[PDB]
Amino acid sequence: SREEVESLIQEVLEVYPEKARKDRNKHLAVNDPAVTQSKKCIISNKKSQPGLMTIRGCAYAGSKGVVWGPIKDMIHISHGPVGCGQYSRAGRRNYYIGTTGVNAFVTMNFTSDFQEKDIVFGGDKKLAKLIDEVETLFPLNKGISVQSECPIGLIGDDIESVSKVKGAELSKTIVPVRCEGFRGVSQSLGHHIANDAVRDWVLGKRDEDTTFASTPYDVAIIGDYNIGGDAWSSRILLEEMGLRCVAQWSGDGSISEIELTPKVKLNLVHCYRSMNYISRHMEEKYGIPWMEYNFFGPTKTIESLRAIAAKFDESIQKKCEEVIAKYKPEWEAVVAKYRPRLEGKRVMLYIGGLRPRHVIGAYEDLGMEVVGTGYEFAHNDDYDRTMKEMGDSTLLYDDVTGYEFEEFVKRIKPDLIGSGIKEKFIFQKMGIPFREMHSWDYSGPYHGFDGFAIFARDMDMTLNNPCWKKLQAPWE
């Protein structure tokens, strides 16, 4: 109930000191589907209170980790000490096709590897030396990007000049990116720093080039990172509908695809938080319109295929119907097999920016009810989009602390919890089935119709796995 959820929030906040307690209450809300504006309900995207175990990453993670790292052809240098590149290497599954270390470098870790001589003297000379070295060793790379770690902003290193001078010397595009960890308050400013970096150094190169032949059906998937091959499964559906996909941002992406993007007629934006900055820019500079779409679950996909097709002519609309007709028996078969298995099960989700709101349709397609949801680093426009999707009196949390999350889960008692790696081991211990939402628990793809079968099957094996019955010892 609303009074009960409200009490639960108040009850939990009692443990915190006052500055932290006062600030946190602003981030916890009981959802009202009716409210138009998020700010009345919840406040978001504010610096985290120290010592509370927030799940948020840094700006480097948002820029190097999510937007930039997935491009296959380019080489990304983690500039600074050795750790950031190391923890983040091959951590995220933005799937790509290439010969690694030769023409594609995603899983590879490239670093300046700062030592104290570099921190005292500075790293510009080294970055230039590294750029030259990178060039002799890996001759087929199509670009270079420098992702700034925290010490770069602090020691006064100018990477723009080195990037500008070397780029000129190598007739190669080098993108300096200032995603220092201290900048921003979450993985979020990183996306913006990364988006802006893409726009200043890589978007306008084929500004005057008219050689590429373009059909009116050309479209670019924006903000789909191909985790587990999500983009590929999403891409095949658009192609079958008759649209041509010129570019993917940035999963399994290439710099050539990105430079050719402005040539496209429409931009489909899957992840609003990460790449909406680029989308708006493209609409202002090139006039290309952008529409947010959802491919999780058969209902969102059908609704999404339909909307995208309307923006196009009747042949496309007709083709859209054939495709929905084609995959309809496949998805319903999955529903028939797995809905009886997952029906009425309550779900709690914590993830960073796009997914808490987005996977709701898919869970509901399986008869599961999402009792509560939250975001690691989502803005309020993200929250505006969230409440319509969330049911009434459901719990909403922004930048939930670890302690808040455990207490909420103990009270609410959800059947299954979708969240990241740090949160997962605590919950299994508690005996609650956990599915990792970020990595799709090394499974996927969860996007599209093909993705949905994997998703229903995954929720079912974990939720109904025999191991949950076994936790209390028989001898009391």
Partner: protein, 522 residues
């Protein structure tokens, strides 16, 4: 498309013809990919000697490092203590990364907190974050002790940890009495091992420095054991079991084994076990302090020898038959307790396994990498097994250590083709396996990729990866293994001989081709 009866995951889903056609179209249509012949030409080039030279000529670019930063080392060590919460002063993205890197290797929850310093915190300093952070963390997680380490942003701006912590207590944010040991842990300097060493000397120093007069050496008749940075549970377990078996009293400082291994019984335990504060306080009263991994325990050796006046024995990490004999004999001399019949039986069994598996093991060539103590230990054991370690790489190693290992290699006729490389990454190693080919690679999960590259050149050129080391993320529960002692040696011996036998079977499995040698009894 998906048959509901047998659903396909990414693999082999993308292997389907519609998807294959789609990817090709995407590759041909928008990727502007270099021709396959060119890609092939370039790939064969990296496998060559000429490329190794240019690759080994690098002075500024590091590709695929074998080392991680200091705070990782500091958080792991802080985890060793009872009801202790690791606390890292600096930016938060670092904490998320440490918890995830640890979570994946241990498949266990890792508790860590940050004071969350921002851009604004960069100009003013870390003082507010530290007071609020210390106050918020204590109220929220109820840790008995909070151990502070710092992120590079904090190290570069220069926040004073001692001043900050004292002012927090002085201003009243946290009690005066609440323990708050702190260690500066610059990521640019060293590695996670050094990070571990710093945190420990700091914790040891905070508890024992003010009171030394009351302490008298050998008064408590226990031997302090300092593990160092360790990611195998069996190691903590084995050291304790043998001392226990021998009857020797002991204190293991920084024991993270209960917490990293808590049971799923329906209740989540943030803190489990750990070294007690009293154990830390009463430590100088030990007869002696033994350091398990001496190469990264140098700062701690200085504090323990100088402040506690313990004469730390020079002993190598207890790996292999000789080193473990040396550690036991030494414990026997310090304890005054004899090595029991039970332990001598275990050594006998190790030798019996060595005599039993020697023909397959002999002459095998290995390329291996890791932290310096572990690599050093492994090198010593392989030579004891008569195997030939061709390429030895320690990224975070040094000149003295290299000198130490070369001496070890010189002592054995087996260490003839062996070469030690320090400051060289996995990219360098890739080149080494391609130019001079080892039978096997012993290392962490990062080597999965080197193996993939060798198989690409050819079946015959592939070097299978054998995983011993940290981090291991593609296999499950290996962190439950033991590398120390006779038990560790036995585990290591079984994995190497079986890795070798598993490979021979694969090579001889072809029907009417190579199956003549695909023997039932080996």
């Amino acid at each position: 498309s998906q048959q509901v009866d047998k659903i396909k995951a990414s693999y082999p889903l993308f292997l389907d013809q519609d998807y294959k056609d789609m990817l090709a179209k995407k590759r041909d249509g928008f990727e502007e990919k270099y021709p396959q012949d060119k890609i092939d030409e370039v790939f064969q080039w990296t496998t060559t000697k000429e490329y190794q030279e240019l690759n080994f000529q690098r002075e500024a670019l590091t590709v695929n490092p074998a080392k991680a930063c200091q705070p990782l080392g500091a958080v792991l060590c802080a985890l060793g203590f009872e009801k202790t919460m690791p606390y890292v002063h600096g930016s938060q993205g670092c904490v998320a990364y440490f918890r995830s890197y640890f979570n994946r290797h241990f498949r266990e929850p890792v508790s860590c907190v940050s004071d969350s310093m921002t851009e604004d915190a960069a100009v003013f300093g870390g003082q507010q974050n530290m007071k609020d952070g210390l106050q918020n963390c204590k109220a929220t997680y109820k840790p008995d002790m909070i151990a502070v380490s710092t992120t590079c942003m904090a190290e570069v701006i220069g926040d004073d940890l001692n001043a900050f912590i004292n002012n927090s207590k002085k201003e009243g944010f946290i009690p005066d009495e609440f323990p708050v040991p702190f260690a500066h842990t610059p990521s640019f300097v060293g590695s996670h091992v050094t990070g571990w060493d710093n945190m420990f000397e700091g914790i040891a120093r905070y508890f024992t420095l003010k009171s030394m007069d009351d302490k008298v050496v050998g008064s408590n008749k226990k031997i302090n054991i300092v593990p160092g940075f360790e990611t195998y549970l069996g190691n903590f377990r084995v050291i304790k079991r043998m001392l226990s078996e021998m009857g020797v009293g002991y204190s293991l400082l920084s024991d993270p084994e209960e917490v990293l291994d808590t049971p799923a019984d329906g209740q989540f335990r943030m803190y489990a076990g750990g070294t007690t504060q009293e154990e830390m306080k009463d430590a100088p009263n030990a007869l002696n302090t033994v350091l398990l991994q001496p190469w990264h325990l140098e700062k701690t050796k200085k504090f323990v020898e100088g402040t506690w006046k313990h004469e730390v024995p020079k002993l190598n990490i207890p790996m292999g038959l000789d080193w473990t004999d040396e550690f036991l004999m030494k414990v026997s001399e310090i304890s005054g307790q004899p090595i029991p019949a039970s332990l001598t039986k275990e050594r006998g069994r190790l030798v019996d396994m060595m005599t039993d598996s020697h023909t397959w093991l002999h002459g095998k060539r290995f390329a291996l990498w890791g932290d310096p103590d572990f690599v050093m230990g492994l090198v010593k054991f392989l030579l004891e097994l008569g195997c030939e370690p061709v390429h030895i790489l320690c990224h975070n190693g040094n000149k003295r250590w290299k000198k130490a290992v070369d001496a070890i290699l010189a002592a054995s006729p087996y260490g003839k083709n062996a070469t030690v490389y320090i400051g060289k990454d996995l990219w360098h190693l890739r080149s080494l396996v391609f130019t001079d080919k080892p039978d096997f690679m012993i290392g962490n999960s990062y080597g999965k990729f080197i193996q993939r590259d060798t198989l690409h050149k050819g079946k015959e050129f592939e070097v299978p990866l054998i995983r011993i080391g940290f981090p291991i993320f593609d296999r499950h529960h290996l962190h439950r293994s033991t590398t120390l002692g006779y038990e560790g040696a036995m585990q290591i011996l079984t994995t190497l001989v079986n890795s070798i036998l598993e490979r021979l079977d694969e090579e001889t499995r072809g029907m009417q081709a190579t199956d003549y040698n695909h023997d039932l009894v080996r």
